[PDB]
Design a binder for these strands. Structure first.
Lengths: 49, 222, 156
DNA sequence: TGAAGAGAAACCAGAGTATACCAGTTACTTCTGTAACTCAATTTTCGGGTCCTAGTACACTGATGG
DNA sequence: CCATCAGTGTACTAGGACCCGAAAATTGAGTTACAGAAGTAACTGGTATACTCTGGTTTCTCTTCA
């Protein structure tokens, strides 16, 4: 039986992978541009929320 | 006789060794000092038709370990060592297998529980936070990355347009290194404005359509 | 343009933030935010009402762990100080930080200049400068009915 | 009257065919410096303190031993 | 008994970071010139990974002579 926890944990990893993918994409743009990136700006908070 | 040769002398002598399985706490106590040359005494008692093996922990080490033998006919085991000087040798062949068990049953689990709890220290758990965090996106006059990159660009300053002759000489000199160059890569080597560089390249050079990646400039005018 | 629009909207709704509270979020410097803000007010041919000191208080005192009593205290102090012209021509954010520092050192939960500088986005030197301007007139700014555990007659 | 091919209904890979990204570059702006007065905000820097832990000198004490 | 020899009870250093405030310097907006260099912001080819009939193949019964 998948209760609220395991069901929620199923969503979180998909949504956390998107978060980690998103910061990778955001950072790659700035790193290629030659300028360091701001971590706070790289994170898209709406992905998990 | 070579580096990869194995010193199989131990096998020739048919030396016998015993394989023993012991818990971590017994070895952990040994690992505590591990240099005193003594950790206990192994006592073996034999009767008319029965043999028993037991081990006693050193009194200093503490501040009964009965042994159970196992059949070795189902699998053949050998012991070998690799010397730091790249000289492998065979210590011997295992002739008996034994296991160590705890004399105590009730309070022994207490030590195991501590180990399980101790190994649980790296197990990180989410922490409830009384007050919402207010230090994020906190006021900054400028992001540090922005000032660093802007300062670098200002210092590096301007791409001067060198006299056509100097630019031409650099282009021809670099042509020897490789047959073809990319426009973006060529700009870095020449360090000239893209529009100015393109005009100079157009005056002599031409671009050839390549079916492998794309149409790229060729430094050869013809 | 997005950051400047965000600032103009926050100001229009009546809950204005500071440029340092939009640069803290956006990826551009406060200078560009202000430039595009003026450019947008020029283009749209609209205007935004002038910020007052009481706008930054429900947020500054709440980002700090101050009680509601200290919050209304600092609100009253700042409003009276800008009333009595103790702080001429100084930015409302620095006056707000100074008033919050006064009401914080006076009341139970004390906060240093550093924390208030971090929250309000005001250099502690500015907090000092605009606190010395309201330093001598401390008592007649505070609310009359005001409980505290540190005498308002002694403040750093 | 089979024989050497004739016809027929299955699989099977591959060559254009079809997408599918993935760069490749033309204008079109801002943004420098200098000048100036203004005022406030913010940073830098700068001489000196400031506190603290850890030895240090030095006169005296207190045996101690021969 | 007068030699000697730890301890002791302190202000006086010795490093050792560290902080507090002041003063100077900068930043920032406003204008208007000036030339040129960054700095994105935009349309427009170009060549490969699937892909879809398709051309050939292959027994397997049969076709057509012979």
């Amino acid at each position: 039986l998948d209760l609220a926890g395991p069901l929620l944990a199923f969503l979180f990893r998909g949504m956390f992978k998107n978060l980690l993918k998103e910061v990778r994409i955001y950072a790659q743009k700035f790193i290629d541009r030659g300028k360091d990136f701001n971590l706070e700006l790289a994170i898209k908070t709406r992905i998990i929320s | 006789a070579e580096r990869g040769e194995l010193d199989l002398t131990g096998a020739k002598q048919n030396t016998g060794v015993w394989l023993v399985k012991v818990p971590k706490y017994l070895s952990q106590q040994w690992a505590k000092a591990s240099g005193r040359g003594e950790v206990g005494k192994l006592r073996i008692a034999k009767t008319q038709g029965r043999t028993e093996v037991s081990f006693t922990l050193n009194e200093d080490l503490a501040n009964e370990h009965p042994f159970v033998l196992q059949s070795v006919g189902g699998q053949t085991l050998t012991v070998f060592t690799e010397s730091s000087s790249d000289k492998l040798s065979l210590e011997g062949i295992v002739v008996q297998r034994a296991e160590c068990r705890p004399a105590a049953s009730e309070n022994y689990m207490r030590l195991k529980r501590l180990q399980i709890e101790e190994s649980s220290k790296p197990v990180r758990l989410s922490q409830q936070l009384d007050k919402v965090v207010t230090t994020n996106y906190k006021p900054v006059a400028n992001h540090q990355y922005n000032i660093e990159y802007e300062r670098k660009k200002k210092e590096d300053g301007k791409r001067a347009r060198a006299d056509k002759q100097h630019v031409l000489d650099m282009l021809f000199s670099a042509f020897e290194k490789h047959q073809y160059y990319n426009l973006k890569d060529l700009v870095d080597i020449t360090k000239q404005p893209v529009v100015y560089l393109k005009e100079i390249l157009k005056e002599i050079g031409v671009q050839n359509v390549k079916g492998i990646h794309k149409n790229t400039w060729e430094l050869k005018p013809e | 343009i997005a950051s400047a629009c965000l600032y103009i909207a926050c100001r229009q709704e009546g809950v204005p933030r500071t440029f340092k509270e939009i640069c803290a979020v956006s990826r551009i410097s406060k200078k560009e935010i202000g430039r595009c803000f003026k450019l947008i007010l020029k283009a749209l041919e609209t205007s935004v009402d002038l910020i007052t000191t009481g706008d930054f208080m429900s947020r500054f005192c709440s980002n700090l762990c101050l009680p509601k009593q200290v919050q209304m205290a600092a609100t009253h102090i700042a409003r009276k100080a800008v009333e009595l012209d103790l702080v001429p021509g100084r930015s409302p954010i620095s006056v707000a930080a100074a008033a919050i520092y006064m009401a914080s050192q006076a009341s139970a939960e004390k906060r240093t200049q550093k924390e208030i500088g971090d929250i309000a986005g005001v250099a502690d030197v500015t907090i000092r400068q605009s606190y010395r301007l309201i330093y001598p007139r401390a008592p007649d700014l505070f609310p009359t009915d005001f409980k505290f555990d540190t005498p308002v007659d002694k403040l750093p």
